[PDB]
Amino acid sequence: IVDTCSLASPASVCRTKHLHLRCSVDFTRRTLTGTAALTVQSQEDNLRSLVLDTKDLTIEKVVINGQEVKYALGERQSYKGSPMEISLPIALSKNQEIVIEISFETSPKSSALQWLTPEQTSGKEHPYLFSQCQAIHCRAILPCQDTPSVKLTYTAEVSVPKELVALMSAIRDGETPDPEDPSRKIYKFIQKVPIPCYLIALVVGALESRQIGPRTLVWSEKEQVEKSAYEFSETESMLKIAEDLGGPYVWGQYDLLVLPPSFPYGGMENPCLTFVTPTLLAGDKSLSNVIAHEISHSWTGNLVTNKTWDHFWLNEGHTVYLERHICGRLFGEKFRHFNALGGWGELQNSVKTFGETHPFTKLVVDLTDIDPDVAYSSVPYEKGFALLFYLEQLLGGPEIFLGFLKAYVEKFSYKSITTDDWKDFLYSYFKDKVDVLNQVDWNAWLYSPGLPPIKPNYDMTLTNACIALSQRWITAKEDDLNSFNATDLKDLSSHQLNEFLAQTLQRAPLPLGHIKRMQEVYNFNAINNSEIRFRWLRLCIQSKWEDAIPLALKMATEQGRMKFTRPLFKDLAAFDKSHDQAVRTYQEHKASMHPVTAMLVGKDLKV
Ligand SMILES: O=C(CCCCCCC(=O)Nc1ccccc1)NO
Ligand SMILES: [Yb+3]
Ligand SMILES: [Zn+2]
């Protein structure tokens, strides 16, 4: 097994056991500067050198046993960064540990980091910094074996301007004034559970907290605290359900941090401190499945981890499966099936977008010479989910398959694993149903592009109204438009309204007159729920409604969740009326965008 996204020595040569990070966040220079002390364990006899990943890091020196040592940085390999070879001063025997202290500074263009000016924040007085290391951005913060095949504990001391707060994916372990600079405070952290380095995270800004459960604080700027506390109030109930499904929660606290709007993902499962988009702040808790997802990664991802990124689906697909059980326990089995079926629709979309023979539609993907951020899609989520839901149905239902899931989490806790590890364990657990498992077309599900070979069975109860209303609109002629009215929506939940629009969007464009009628009778322009507004605006732009141009440009730029920003820019570029403005808008905003989002939007727009 080779990690084709990492240039570091593999785990078979040496393993990092601990990181102690001492750093200072310099907002004037947009640099993090300090020392990364790696405790490294040789796995070989006579070990005399090793290699770490880095990306846009300036290295000042490397210290082992109190003396500077030789090191060299290799040529940059695009998104992978530059390998750093370190010459050890004394050859190591197998299992010997040493500490390697590297003094480094980050680049302002670090792909792991977004540096925000005061104007870019809610409070407008103070700047803000946040990280996003998954998949392979930790190397752009500090030198490391930047591979999920290696798990380490960490401690950290972070010096920041004294008016600001630092938080990490770790337990808070104190704060004191910085003795080197009384304008600063050092915040300390400890992560005692071994983690892959993609789970290292840092935020610095003017943060406040509010308790919302026995093991949960919400953190955000002051302006968002009250709304966030309400929106995420189900979090303890979800954690309790998740513990029933997965076993004990091992991480101590489960805090939430609500980022500024350019955070690129819905959420990120950083241990102890899940990061979430403010786009979840719908006002009615309706987008709480994202919280259930991130919670679920406390087991599937954070405890049992993909050994390399080719096996991402292990992390995401199992998380989606647990996510959907939490939501089904809370809101009912009919809702689990509704969400499940919605997920298949998203998979349909992704397969159509890439093409049915595209490599990135395989469940296990080969990332040789592929930047994960470019290949990122709904495929691992939803083809993964569909496999597990198909297995659930084959093997005797949800209670049975949940016994497997708990057993799997137990078996592989604290480890990093491959698809074949998972498959082997599935066969071991279900050894009395091997004949059933042998009906599965493993090669097609795991290794073939396109839609899966079999579609699961779904309860249609909550979906039927959505499909019926979509079909009414699609089949309407001009003389049927008058028949639509606001009462059509009266028995539909926000989730159903979303699914009505996703179903309709799958047949877009519709006639411009239909779309104008839809606004006249349903007033979708008034809905601030981000998922609904996203699909509505896509529907309007694809249907060539010029009045939607400013609305779509506004949503694309006022937040930066890539789920929303990328397809809105792409749709606006594809509409001749908005094309030039879309490209100008991107060009104007690009320097102030998150670095990954900026990259991908530029690729999408061919800029
Ligand atoms: O699932 C999420 C949202 C995505 C968070 C970022 C994932 C980045 C990543 O690991 N990308 C990737 C990995 C493998 C293959 C392709 C992309 N939160 O839990
Ligand atoms: Yb030896
Ligand atoms: Zn996830």
The CA-to-CA distance between both ends of the chain, in Å, stands at: 36
- Residue nearest ligand 1's atom 6 by CA: 134
**Residues in the ligand 1 pocket, defined by CB under 6 Å:** 134-135, 265-269, 293-294, 297, 309, 312, 316, 372, 375-376
Experiment type: X-ray
Catalytic positions, written as ranges: 294, 381
Selection from 427, 437, 521 nearest residue 472 by Cα: 521
Could you say which ligand is closest to the alpha carbon of residue 359?
A: 1
**What is the amino acid identity at position 166?**
A
Question: What is the chain's Cα-based Rg?
Answer: 25
What six digits make up the tokens of 493?
């939940």
Q: How many other C-beta atoms lie within 10 A of the C-beta of residue 180?
A: 10
Measuring from atom 4 of ligand 1, which residue has the nearest CA? 265
Q: Where in the chain is the domain with CATH 3.30.2010.30?
A: 206-302
Q: Is 415 helix (H, G, I), strand (E, B) or coil?
A: strand
- Judged by its nearest atom, the ligand closest to the C-alpha of residue 92 is 2
Neighbours of 28 (CB within 10 A): 6
Show binding-site residues.
132-134, 264-269, 293, 297, 316, 561-563
Tell me the best of 259, 265, 276, 324 to mutate to test the pocket of ligand 1, counting ligand atoms within 8 Å of each CB and taking the most: 265
Question: How is residue 349 written in tokens?
Answer: 């979309």
Tokens of 406: 């708990």
Q: Which atom of ligand 1 is nearest to the CA of 365?
A: 15
Instruction: Please give, one letter per residue, the 3-state secondary structure of 433-483.
Output: HHHHHCCCCHHHHHHCCCCCCCCCCCCCCCCHHHHHHHHHHHHCCHHHHHH
3-state DSSP assignment of residue 209: strand
Phi-psi label, residue 362: left if phi above 0, alpha if psi -120 to 50, beta otherwise: beta
Sheet holding 202-205, edge to edge: 113-116, 128-131, 202-205, 165-168
- DSSP string covering 87-114: EEEEEE-TT-EEEEEEEEEE-TT-TTEE
Residue the block writes with tokens 């296990």: 364
Q: Which atom of ligand 1 is nearest to the CA of 266?
A: 3
Annotated binding site for Zn(2+): 293, 297, 316
Token code pair at residue 153:
């504990």
Resolution of the structure, angstroms: 1.7
- CA of residue 15 to ligand 2 center, whole Å: 18
Atom of ligand 1 nearest to the CA of 132: 6
Do strands 14-26 and 152-161 pair parallel, antiparallel, or not at all (unpaired)?
Answer: parallel
Q: Is 371 strand, coil or helix?
A: coil
Q: How far is the CA of 222 from the centre of ligand 1 (A)?
A: 29
Q: CATH for 13-205?
A: 2.60.40.1730
Residues 6 or more apart in contact with residue 104 via CB below 8 angstroms:
33, 34, 35, 36, 54, 57, 58, 59, 60, 142, 143
Ligand closest to Cα of 91 equals: 2
d(CA 121, CA 115): 11
How far is C-alpha 455 from the geometric centre of its chain's CA atoms? 26
Architecture of the domain delimited by 206-302: 2-Layer Sandwich (3.30)
| Nearest partner of 532 among 499, 563, 572, judged by Cα | 499
Residue with token string 């397969």? 351
In the chain, CATH 1.10.390.10 sits at 303-460
What is the DSSP secondary-structure string of 53-68? Answer: EESSEEEEEEEETTEE
Superfamily for 303-460? Neutral Protease Domain 2 (1.10.390.10)
- Nearest CA residue ID for atom 1, ligand 1: 316
Query: How many residues are there in the chain?
Result: 607
Rounded to the nearest whole angstrom, what is the distance from the C-alpha of residue 64 to the centroid of ligand 2? Answer: 20
Domain with CATH 2.60.40.1730 in the chain: 13-205
* CA max distance for the chain: 85
Amino acid sitting at position 361: T
Domain with CATH 1.25.40.320 in the chain: 461-607
C-alpha distances (whole Å) from 202 to each of 19, 100, 225, 273, 363 are 14, 22, 19, 10, 31
| CB 542, CB 571: distance < 8 Å | yes
Which of 603, 567, 559 has the alpha carbon at shortest distance from 349? 567
* H helices present in 209-331, as ranges: 222-231, 235-246, 289-296, 312-331
Q: What CATH class is the domain 461-607?
A: mainly alpha
- What HEC string does 108-167 produce? CCCCCEEEECHHHCCCCCCCEEEECCCCCCHHHCCCECCCCCCCEEEEEEEEEECCCEEE
The rounded distance, in Å, linking the Cα atoms of 295 and 172 is 19
Taking residue 288's Cβ as centre, other Cβ atoms within 10 Å add up to 22
d(CA 53, CA 49): 14
**Residue 544: other Cβ atoms inside 10 A:** 16
